[PDB]
Design a binder for this molecule. Sequence first.
Ligand code: MG
Ligand code: MG
Ligand code: MG
Ligand code: NA
Length: 314
Amino acid sequence: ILNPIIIQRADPMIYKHNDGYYYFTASVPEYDRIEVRKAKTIEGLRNAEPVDVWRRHESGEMSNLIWAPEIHFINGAWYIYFAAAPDKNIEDDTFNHRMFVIQNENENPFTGNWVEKGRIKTAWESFSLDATIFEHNEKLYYVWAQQDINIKGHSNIYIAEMENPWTLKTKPVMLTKPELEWEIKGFWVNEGPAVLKKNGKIFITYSASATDVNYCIGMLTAEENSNLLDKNSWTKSQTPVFKTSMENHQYGPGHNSFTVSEDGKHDVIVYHARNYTEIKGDPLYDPNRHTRAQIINWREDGTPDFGVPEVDSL
Ligand SMILES: [Mg+2]
Ligand SMILES: [Mg+2]
Ligand SMILES: [Mg+2]
Ligand code: NA
């Protein structure tokens, strides 16, 4: 794969649909809308024309800092899960994002049939973002980042089971909080969860530390038939599974997703990183996190080896 695939797109999410095609969304640098594009191949996404399917509200809950959309197809309909804030105030050390979802029941997600389901409520109200979804044994799970005032830092990773694609039916179960030295650089953060199933296991990668050079990816692992809503089922990687490569000039890799290659043979990690280190301004407004993709290697023991972020090809 020739990297980067797409410049100036953060929190990249590629979904390979059953029409053959890959659909991509991401955080745009203006944080003001949800862009989607389609192509037959991963590298085809570079040149695919993006379409804004949804734009921030003028005021109120979905009006600011539109972050990290993911496009999913569940039970015959499209869902895009995203976060948004009512303003840019900082309260309890963080922005005040909540989580939303828009649904499109039409086969073609570019049609103008996106319905706001509203706010996906959890057991308490605080900074919440970066939701993703997975299915196991006909149950649907929601995995997301949220702050708890009684747990140190900006956000922890939670899982819950869902009643439907916009509604939880359990309390949040905390799986990781920021605490290891590589999770607490800049800010104490666990965010950007992504789920990969392979080898009788479920892997939840997540990103940690601030969104500069220190950003990196950790991982939780569970046996697929364990009790997924018990923290003790999940083993937390002691060191990052993916991090800055000083040698390759790729800095702060993170907020990954997972897809598969065109022939279906390989798993692919899709992530953002910068190719310079001295940002010299507020990182939130530096637009140069670029979207990148690499093949995942599998070890003898069934665990994934993500390697290192590869050098730019262009
Ligand atoms: Mg599917
Ligand atoms: Mg506080
Ligand atoms: Mg995500
Ligand atoms: Na906050």
